[PDB]
Amino acid sequence: GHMAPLPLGRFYIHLNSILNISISEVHSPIKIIVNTPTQNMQLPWQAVNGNNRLDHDFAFHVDDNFKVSFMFLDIPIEIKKVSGTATLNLGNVKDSCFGKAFNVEIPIISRGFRTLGNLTLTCLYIPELSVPEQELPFTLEQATMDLRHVRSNYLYNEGYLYRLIRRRFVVLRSKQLNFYAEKGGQYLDTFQLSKTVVSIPMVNFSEAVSNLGLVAGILATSVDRRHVQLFADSKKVCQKWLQVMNSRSFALDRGTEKLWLQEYVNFM
Amino acid sequence: GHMAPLPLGRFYIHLNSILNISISEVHSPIKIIVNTPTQNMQLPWQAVNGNNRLDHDFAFHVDDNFKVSFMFLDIPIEIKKVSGTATLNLGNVKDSCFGKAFNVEIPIISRGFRTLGNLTLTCLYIPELSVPEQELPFTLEQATMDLRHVRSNYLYNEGYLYRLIRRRFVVLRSKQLNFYAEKGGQYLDTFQLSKTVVSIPMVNFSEAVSNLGLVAGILATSVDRRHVQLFADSKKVCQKWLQVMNSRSFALDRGTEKLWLQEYVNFM
């Protein structure tokens, strides 16, 4: 759908655990310092016994340059108090958590830098929707509970097609296509279609492909900003693949009655 | 100084205590839910014994419509778990915490509404300054530690002056002026000058004040958006009061060498 020149949206974080760290039975309230651009918070974390379980949720109005920082202060090891920071960059996990929950592990680099332990959290990105604030989920658990009303439409298509070298039996499932040797000989490559930019037919044929007998072409772009050019010797074929490869990726369940989910689907 | 059409700045909160509430020795991790516009966070608060001491700091990039909300969930009373919310409006405390720390008490209204207890916190507002983010304080304690390098300039002036009824011995100290009966007879009223809008001389005299022999006038505005009109029978007098009542309110200490403090002073 429509995005701001610098894409805005919602970022849900749920801190889970601090792994590979032996926390002492004896306690002294640990400061958890969370740093976002333009904002800051300082939290006392009391860990009964040596429990390494974090139960901290966060919802951030966010832009694409976002980079949350998690600093733990005076962690007692079984005294020796250690301090470290774990910074989570949105751009490095946006694709893997776009409209879906994604567990990620970020290291807690010691002060002055090696690595103390590993901070585990669950993230999930939701783009900006023209929907009231009181209609969005406040927690990650609430979002995923609603997001399971979003079915992925069955999408299957197969056939021969030229790309840049020779014609191969492309097989498309959902947004994923796989290059195949012969018809079903071998899988040659995957190219996961982008959930943003739309594939467009070609109008400027190459000098070489014109000699091969190729009439119409297809340009596709993935989630990794990498491109690929598809060519077919027939016209009707090109308006057949682009017709299915650019159809609606997702649909919504019946009776969901959620304003933001409807808008999230229309966005895609 | 210069402000955006909707004034932006920094808001520092430090939660202190939950008063008038008997918290149980027995524990079950309390969720602290903080709600700001566009953002949300869920914190586990573990209170050793029955300690009602909160040690939570917050720094918010803020606008004038800001309204932070603090919800406490499943508070155990000495079992009976109680839940409540305490919302702090920036507009109701902005004047009292502008460039200075200010302890305020906000009630924790029970779910469904009477009042459980009282949330005590310390706040402090800092306007938007053309200064790098890495040059601002991250915590309230850090701001007040720097803000004590900001001296209030000695300002004293006295004399007779007409206002709207008769002439009275106005006495100005800093930004505060006091109306006096006779010369030092009685204090009639205070009018704390605004730290934003500037007082301006008059050019359109009243039909009545022209007969009293009043030549030049003075218009002043307070921090409460309320106005007052000052009149003097002499011209030189009006350019004397407006010269001192609109002089620099604050100055900076020597050797402070702080970028944001310099800008905060130039802002005033």
Domains of chain A listed by start with CATH number? 8-147 (2.60.40.150), 154-245 (2.30.29.30)
Answer whether A39 sits within 8 Å of B38, measured CB to CB: no
Question: DSSP 3-state assignment of B111?
Answer: coil
Cα separation, B126 vs A172, whole angstroms:
56
The rounded Cα A90 to chain-centroid distance in angstroms is 9
**Chain B, nearest residue to A55 by Cα:** B44
Q: Which helix (H) or strand (E) holds A229?
A: strand A227-232
Question: Mutation test of the interface with chain A: which of B27, B46, B141, choosing the one with the most A Cβ atoms within 10 A?
Answer: B46
Q: Which residues of B touch A27 (CB under 8 A)?
A: 48
Residues 6+ apart with CB under 8 A from B11: B58, B59, B60, B62, B66, B68, B90, B123, B124, B125, B126
Answer whether A59 sits within 8 Å of B48, measured CB to CB: no
Answer whether A59 sits within 8 Å of B40, measured CB to CB: yes
**Chain A, nearest residue to B13 by Cα:** A41
N-terminal to C-terminal alpha carbon distance within chain A = 6
Nearest to B41 among A29, A44, A58 (CB): A58
Helix axes B140-147, B259-267, angle to 10 degrees: 70
Cα separation, B252 vs B193, whole angstroms:
20
- Picking from A11, A14, A99, the residue whose alpha carbon sits closest to that of residue A56 is A14
Query: B-contacting residues of A 44-63, CB under 8 Å?
Result: 44-46, 48, 54-61
Q: Which residue has the tokens 């439409």?
A: A153
Q: Which residues of B touch A42 (CB under 8 A)?
A: 55-58, 139
Nearest to B39 among A44, A59, A139 (CB): A59
User: Could you give the residue ranges of the DSSP H alpha helices within chain A?
Assistant: 94-97, 140-147, 209-212, 235-245, 259-267
* B179 min Cα distance to partner chain A (Å): 43
Residue B85 main-chain phi, psi, to 5 deg: -135, 140
Decide: B120 and B107 in contact? Cβ < 8 Å: no
Cα separation, B210 vs A200, whole angstroms:
78
Cα separation, B119 vs B19, whole angstroms:
6
Distances (CA, A) of A35 to A144, A164, B88: 25, 45, 22
Q: Strand A186-192 to strand A200-201: parallel, antiparallel, or no bridges (unpaired)? A: unpaired
Torsion of CA B123, A12, B54, B21, to 10 degrees: 110
For residue B196 the two structure tokens come to: 């934003």
For residue B266 the two structure tokens come to: 């130039």
Question: DSSP 3-state assignment of A197?
Answer: coil
Answer whether A56 sits within 8 Å of B44, measured CB to CB: yes
What's the CA angle centered on B120, arms B42 and B49, to 5 degrees? 70
Resolution of the experimental structure, in angstroms: 2.8
Decide: A13 and A138 in contact? Cβ < 8 Å: no
Residues 6+ apart with CB under 8 A from A155: A172, A173, A174, A175, A244, A247, A249
